[PDB]
Every structure is written in structure tokens, then in C-alpha cells.
Write a protein that binds this ligand. Structure first.
Ligand SMILES: CC(C)CCC[C@@H](C)[C@H]1CC[C@H]2[C@@H]3CC=C4C[C@@H](O)CC[C@]4(C)[C@H]3CC[C@]12C
Ligand SMILES: CC(C)CCC[C@@H](C)[C@H]1CC[C@H]2[C@@H]3CC=C4C[C@@H](O)CC[C@]4(C)[C@H]3CC[C@]12C
Lengths: 512, 512
């Protein structure tokens, strides 16, 4: 059962969706070096740490933190907050994918050309800019902004709700609802179809994506860094949080994976073999999308920095462009739109039940297996559905960025990641942990992650935090929109809701 | 130990060397369909067959054929002949790789430009043909033909021996000699370095290879087929033999792999997981090289059919071109030249000892473990070294093609593959085989390979044989050179040496 969730909750759309966006927004290749140092310094170390603690305790995420130390036990509650706030917009990511999929059930793709009612008259076809109001946009960009989101001018103007997204969001929630209620495994039928279908097509996208004439500009922008961007701290926090995002760590779902693994079982190899591949697929997917970005870069005459839209949903623009350029677009458009669900639902299936199994034992005597649990699954889905309706609003894209940058990223993941390595290294003792691991996997793991949990990762988490404090640059959308002061406070309160889980519990735990 | 040889003898240079050549010589995409039908019809079926029989008998290749049936026991002897005739030129393939590697230990690669003594004055630089004796050649083409082979005008003119290749061939034989004598495993130190280094760089070659502006022509030529080429039978036999070559089947080395696997062990999954990947890596490598071929195709102004040299050694032309175009050519040239040994030596290490373990028990009372075996390893290497000196001669490239097309390919592999599936399906009985397999791997394998061994594979082997008989087109080099009648007879006698192993043994076995 553990292997199934590895292909499920462990694998996330952020590898193919957020990773190219996070790299794109933070310059180009200047993202890669912080990505790699954060990976090799904390990511794989803390990944093996949380897997091994879940295996050693053979219990849940919340209970393991208490067992290691009665103090600092709020990491589990923070993880529950993070997974809920992650689900509430991951589900609307899948809703956007499904709405796109339904729109692709046509002879001609809607974003192939912009001659429809919704498209702005200033829209202009992609190919003819060079064959022949200087600001000219692209049909695919417009489709995502208006037909899909109908983005409002500002967050202070919500606007009318888009019923088309709501029904699509209704479908994905029900799909997640029935499988969990019926006890359906994350991978339907044969795991191979849920596994080889993603890997094959990312290669398919990679093959033509690299074949595109503009791939040379994209790869150079993807790989070559800028030292100037390294000074500005937001590239560091984004690179780190991508590590805590793609590997779905500091969520507590992977802790259940450890309990699933046998107490006497070598999980060390499984951590790094899957961890390196997860970065490899993310890196490989970077080549395809950035080549597509490079392909559109030379051919609109616009720089690579502003050729794309610097908002979440980049994977909803680049690859849909590629499939239109790829022969027989309708067949390829559906398949890529299918797997986006196949990459997301399994992630959703594992992670959503992650807190469900975390909450059933958290509040016993009322969540018994049977009548009480079925309403709870409906209860948790319904309350999250209503919270998910904020993004269905025309102005909900601005709300969407708030969760993405604050609820399950930014300082939120750095703070919890610090306290995860802090408790083991100093309070529990890294040597005490390794003493079990020698008896668990059969041999001593390398001291390198012990030092990583000791100084490297604590400095990596702490260093970016103060760098953000002194060099506080407010978050922006599409590098052109500034949120109001109250909007930032709403996003921070979400982080502070995850922040105060730990500091309050010690105050809570000391009183009795 | 079985897994080590999977990364060793099972993986061959023919995936990255012979597969792109065989596809290139037989048109373009017209090679793929016969490749795939032969794969799914015989390749994986007969692969699982030979693995499962090696596992069931837990013995050697020669002994297993006798155990299944006293008649038709010459398949083992034929396999020994095939592995010896394969080694004798696989080793000089590695010798060419090493000579190239030693020539690459310089600031400027010798084939980057042709301004040296050996290069013909009619040679001309690659880049300037379009910036500005119509037949103009390429510096990389000349380098392989003269500096590396000094190819003679005809096979009837051997010419002086090239001492530079002989010492390089001496090095590789010694390298294979010491490891086998010292009992060194196929993969040195950590298997990961011998495994991740090949896979990483083929992606590296793929990344820029697809990035090359001419990749569009190459992929279209790689994928789009021609029905006209399908009529001419040589595309069929080459596609089939590539299956029997890349998977190293009908050699008897993989039979030792079956004996290594536990009697009660599910080897069925290991066969298809590794088999599909072997085709996948071959197919993926096809994209990189043909894009390189497409890259040079548009940029010399010559058609894709004749842009390259239609002789064995294509992987010694395309990729060495790519590394020169790839920035910092010296660093990349060495690494690709290292792995060609790393892909070949492990293949050599497993296969050469394959007959050694096959011959030690074949002739007991004289090949005892100790003094008798050490001279035999020297004896087998020395006699093969002298036979390998034929290719070191300036005219040995024409000899080289004779082994490649006859000794370990062509009708040679079809004839043995037919008799492998013939004995199990009719004499032994496919149902009798599956009865064990149900008790071996725990469940019944799919009837599909049973029918494959019954009618599909026998028709596939038989059909191409008569098609070659009636439509007999003599072998040619670079689609421009015709061998003399005696040269063809010498090549056929080599096949007939492998052919007559079976028909004689029944005549031999019936007398006593
Ligand atoms: C997945 C791992 C192996 C990383 C991928 C390859 C690594 C080693 C990188 C490092 C340097 C890179 C090259 C740097 C510059 C260029 C020139 C550009 O016009 C095409 C891409 C190309 C040729 C890059 C290809 C990928 C490359 C070779
Ligand atoms: C490894 C497996 C998945 C096969 C690889 C991909 C398969 C499905 C093939 C089938 C059709 C192929 C496409 C057919 C035509 C073209 C147009 C050409 O100008 C660039 C390559 C491109 C875009 C090909 C890319 C690879 C492709 C998509």
C-alpha cells in the first residue's frame, strides 16, 4: 500500500505545474542552483528523516511528534492545516484541468485561434506577427484569463461566480469522494497505466518541445543563471519551498507511508531512488516547457521574461500551445488533459485521506468507523468545497495566489521544516536516531544528513527567514499587480494559522 | 549475480550502435514497424522462454537443450559459435572506441577540422558549404575512413596492418582478461556509476540532438515509414536480427542468467520490464542520432539517405559530431568515449565468460579449476586476438561487415530462433512448459506467447527465410561496394558453421 501512495500523494502537479512556474518567476537558471543546494542540503535528508521516523514509530504524523518529545508536538497540527489549505486549491487546479478537458471535446481547440465572442478584439493570431496598440497578446493567454477565469481587474472586485468552473469543481470533489468512501486504491486497476502514461507523454512533450526551433533560447534561459537574482531572497525561499512542495514533505501524509513500511525494512534506498527521480522528472519537465517558452519567445519577438504570463497556470498555457502545434491536436490535447487529472487525483486521493486518518483518531468517541465517518467525509468535502468556491469567482485567481504563496509555501514550509530538524538533532539526538536506523535498515546511514539536520538545514531555513524579514518585497501577480495591505494580512494570517500551531501547543502542553 | 549481467551482457552497443545503423540502412521509419511486430511477436516471448527454461533446468545453455530433448541439442553448440563470432568483432568495436578515446586526449579534436596530413585535399569544412568535384565529404567521415581505418579500395587488397589499432585491441583484450581471471564482477565498484552514467548522457545527447535545428527532418525520417521498402525482404531480416542482437538472445549467455535466478522466483516481470526498457533506450537513442543525422542532412544539402556513411561505425560519426557542436567538446568527447567502453566491456565481460563456463564443463577432465583454466583463458583470448587482427588490417572493415551481417545476424539468428520455439511448442509442448511456470512464478503466464511460439514466431522466422531465398540481393557496403563471390561464400560458411551445428548433431546423436 505504501508504494501506491508513492505514485500518488508523493507525486504532485507542482513538479510539472509549479516547478516551471517557480523557475520562470525567479529569473531563469538562477533558480536551479538554490534548487539543487536546497535539495542536497535539506530535501533528501529531511525526506529520509520523516520516512524513517514514521517507520520507527509505526504511527501517525501527529502522534509521532508527541512520542519523540511532548514539547514541540504542534508540527502535526500545522501539517493538518497545511494539507487542508493545500487541498482547497489543488482541487481547483484539477477543476481547471477538467474544464479545459471538456472544452477540448471539439473538432477545433478553442485556444487554437481567437475569433470567438469572449476574445478581446485586440487579440491577434500567434503565427502572423512576424509575417507582417503595440501590446499584442496571444489567444492561449486570453483563453486562460477570460474564457477560463474571467479575471477581475482587482481582488477588491470579486464579481459574479462562474458556474462552469463550479460544476467542474463539483465533479472532481465527487470523484475524490466516492473513491475514498468505497476504499478505492489510489491507482485504478493496473498501476502501470497510472504510471507509464505520465512518463511516456512528458517524453512526448519533451521530444517535440526540444524539436521546436526556439528550444535553444529556452534551455539557455533554463540553465544559465544570474548572480544578481541570487541576492534578492525570494529566489531562495521559492527554491526551498519547491522542495517542500514537490516531495509533499512537512504535510504528515508521508509519515503514514513510514508506518506502512515494515519496521525491519530498508527504506533508505527507496527514499533517494524516488527522491532523485522526482527531481529528475521535474528537471526533465523543465526542459520541455522552457523550450516551449523559448519557442514562443523568439516567435512573438518578446523577451523570455515576459513572453509568458507570470501567474499560476503556466502549465495551462505552454503545453496546450504545444499540442496545438503538435499534429492531430485534438487527440494529444485530450490525453495530456487526462493525465493532469491522473497526476493530480492520485495525489489528491492520498493527501486528502491523510488528514482524514489523522482526524479520525485525533477526535475519538465521535468518529467511529461507520455512520459517523461517512458524514465526516461529506462534511470535510462540503466545507472545503465552499472554501473552494472562492476561486470559482472571477476574482478568485488573486485569492488563488494567496494560498499558493502563503498557505502551503513561503515561510510556512521553512518554519515547519526548521522545527522538524531542530527537534531530532538537539533534543532527541541524531546519534540516537541513527542507532535505530542501523538496526532498521541493517547498516548505518551516512553522517552527511546528520550534519544537514544539525547546521546545514537549520541555517538554510533560518537564513532565508531573516533575509525575507529585512528585504521584505510584497508579493505581486504577473509582476504587474500589487495586492492591498489587508490582502497580505489575510495571506499571512493563513501562514500564522499554520505558524501558531507549534508555539501555542507548548503553552497548551505546559499548563496541565 | 543475475542482475549484474542484465546491466552487462544483456545491454549491448547494438542498441546505440547497430540499431541506428540497421534503421538507417533500411530506409527510415519503414524499419520501425517490422521492428515492433518482430519484438511483440517473438522477441519478448522467446526472451521469457529462454529465461524460464534456464531457470527451470538451473543448468547451462548446452545442457538444457539436451535435457528438453536428446534430439535438436545442437542449439547450444550453435550458440557457442555465435558468441565466439560475436566477440571477435565486438572487441574490435571497443578497440575503435579506445583508439578514438586516445585521439581525443588533445586540446582540439582531430575530426573538428580536416587540415592534417591524412585528410584528402578534397575534404572541406562542415559549416561553410552553404555560406559559400561536386562530391564534397565531411571531416568526420574522412577521419573514420582513413585516420581510423585507412580503408582499402577492395577486400582483395588487405594492405599493411595498422599498429595503432592493434595496441588498442591489445588493451581491451587484456582488460577483459584480467577481470575474468581475477573474478571481477561485470560492474566495477558501485553498479550505479556503471548504470546512471550511460542513461544520463544518452539524455544529454538527446537534449542537444533534439535541440539541433535539423531534428525535424530526422524525426520525420525516423518515424514515417515507406511501404515500398517493406516489400524488399532485407528490412524484415534486419529488424528481426536487431531483436536477436540487442537482447543478446540465442547466444546461451542469458541461459546462465536463468540458472542464476531462484527456481521458485517470478522472473516473468523482470523479462518484460527490462525488455521494454531495452527497446525504449534503443528507440530513445534513435531520436538523438537521427536528429543529428537530420541536423547534418539539412546543413550539407544532401538527402538523409546519403548524408551519412552506410557502413558500421555510424555511432562513431554522429555522436562525435554532436560533442564537437556541444560546448566544451573535449570534456564531452571523453565522457561519451568512456561509456562506449562502459557499455561494451560489461557486455563483453558477461558474454565472453558465457562460453568459458560453457566450455569448461563441455570438455571435463582437462579444464579443471586452477592451472588448466588459466592457460585456457589465455588460449581463448590469444586465438580470438589473432582472428581479431583481420579487422586491424586496412581492408578489415570489409571483413568486419561479413561477421556483422552473417556471423551473428541475418539468417543465422532466424534459423536458431525458429528451432528454439519449434522444440518447445510441438515436441515438449507449450502447455507442459506453462505447467511448470504456474508453479514457478506463482501464476499462469498469458497464452499469447504460447501461440507466438506456436505459429507467429515460426511463421516470422520461416517467412523471411524464403523471402531471402527467392529475392536474394547480395550484401553491399555503403550501398556502393559489391563483394566478390568468394567473399560471400566465406560469410555464408560462417553462417553454415553455425547452421550445421543442429543438423549434424541429430546425425551424430542417432549413431550411438
Ligand atoms: C539531466 C542531466 C543529465 C542534466 C542535463 C544535461 C546537462 C549536463 C546540461 C549541462 C550543459 C547543458 C548544455 C549547455 C548549452 C547548450 C547550448 C544550447 O543551444 C542547447 C542546449 C545545450 C547543448 C545544453 C544541453 C544540456 C546540458 C549538456
Ligand atoms: C517513446 C514513445 C512514447 C514514442 C515517442 C512519441 C510518439 C508517440 C511519436 C508519434 C508521432 C510523433 C510526432 C510525429 C511528427 C512530428 C513532427 C516533427 O516535426 C517533430 C516531431 C513530431 C512532433 C513527432 C514527435 C514524436 C511522436 C509524438
Amino acid at each position: 500500500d505504501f508504494v501506491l501512495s508513492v505514485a500518488g500523494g508523493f507525486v504532485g502537479l507542482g513538479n510539472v505545474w509549479r516547478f516551471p512556474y517557480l523557475c520562470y518567476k525567479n529569473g531563469g537558471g538562477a533558480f536551479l542552483i538554490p534548487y539543487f543546494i536546497f535539495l542536497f542540503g535539506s530535501g533528501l535528508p529531511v525526506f529520509f528523516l520523516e520516512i524513517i521516523i514514521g517507520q520507527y514509530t509505526s504511527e501517525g504524523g501527529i502522534t509521532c511528534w508527541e512520542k519523540i518529545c511532548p514539547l514541540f508536538s504542534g508540527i502535526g497540527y500545522a501539517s493538518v492545516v497545511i494539507v487542508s489549505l493545500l487541498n482547497v486549491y489543488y482541487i481547483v487546479i484539477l477543476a481547471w484541468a477538467t474544464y479545459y478537458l471538456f472544452q477540448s471535446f471539439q473538432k477545433e481547440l478553442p485556444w487554437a485561434h481567437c475569433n470567438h465572442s469572449w476574445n478581446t478584439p485586440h487579440c491577434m493570431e500567434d503565427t502572423m506577427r512576424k509575417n507582417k496598440s503595440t501590446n499584442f497578446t496571444s489567444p492561449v493567454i486570453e483563453f486562460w484569463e477570460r474564457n477560463v477565469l474571467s479575471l477581475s481587474p482587482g481582488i477588491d472586485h470579486p464579481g459574479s461566480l462562474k458556474w462552469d468552473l463550479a460544476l467542474c469543481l463539483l465533479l472532481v470533489w465527487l470523484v475524490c469522494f466516492f473513491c475514498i468512501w468505497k476504499g478505492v486504491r489510489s491507482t485504478g486497476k493496473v498501476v502501470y497505466f497510472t504510471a507509464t502514461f505520465p512518463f511516456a507523454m512528458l517524453l512526448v512533450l519533451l521530444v517535440r518541445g526540444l524539436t521546436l526551433p526556439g528550444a535553444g533560447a529556452g534551455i539557455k534561459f533554463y540553465l544559465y543563471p544570474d548572480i544578481t537574482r541570487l541576492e534578492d531572497p525570494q529566489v531562495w525561499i521559492d527554491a526551498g519551498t519547491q522542495i517542500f512542495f514537490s516531495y509533499a514533505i512537512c504535510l504528515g501524509a508521508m509519515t503514514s507511508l513510514g508506518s506502512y513500511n515494515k519496521y525491519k525494512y530498508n527504506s533508505y534506498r527507496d527514499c533517494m531512488l524516488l527522491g532523485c527521480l522526482n527531481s529528475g522528472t521535474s528537471f526533465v519537465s523543465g526542459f520541455a516547457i522552457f523550450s516551449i517558452l523559448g519557442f514562443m519567445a523568439q516567435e512573438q519577438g518578446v523577451d523570455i521574461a515576459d513572453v509568458a504570463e507570470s501567474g499560476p497556470g503556466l502549465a495551462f498555457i505552454a503545453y496546450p500551445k504545444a499540442v496545438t502545434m503538435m499534429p492531430l491536436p485534438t487527440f494529444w490535447s485530450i490525453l495530456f488533459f487526462i493525465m493532469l487529472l491522473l497526476l493530480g487525483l492520485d495525489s489528491q486521493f492520498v493527501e486528502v485521506e491523510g488528514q482524514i486518518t489523522s482526524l479520525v483518531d485525533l477526535y475519538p468517541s465521535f468518529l467511529r468507523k461507520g455512520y459517523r465517518r461517512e458524514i465526516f467525509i461529506a462534511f470535510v468535502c462540503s466545507i472545503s468545497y465552499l472554501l473552494g468556491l472562492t476561486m470559482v469567482t472571477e476574482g478568485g485567481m488573486y485569492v488563488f495566489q494567496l494560498f499558493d504563496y502563503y498557505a502551503a509555501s513561503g515561510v510556512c514550509l521553512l518554519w515547519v521544516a526548521f522545527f522538524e530538524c531542530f527537534v531530532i538533532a538537539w533534543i532527541y539526538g541524531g546519534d540516537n536516531l541513527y542507532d535505530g536506523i542501523e538496526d532498521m535498515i541493517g547498516y548505518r546511514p551516512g553522517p552527511w544528513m546528520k550534519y544537514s539536520w544539525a547546521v546545514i538545514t537549520p541555517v538554510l531555513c533560518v537564513g532565508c527567514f531573516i533575509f525575507s524579514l529585512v528585504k521584505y518585497v510584497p508579493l505581486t501577480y504577473n509582476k504587474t499587480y500589487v495586492y492591498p495591505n489587508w490582502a497580505i494580512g489575510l495571506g499571512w494570517s493563513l501562514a500564522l494559522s499554520s505558524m501558531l500551531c507549534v508555539p501555542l501547543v507548548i503553552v497548551i502542553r505546559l499548563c496541565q
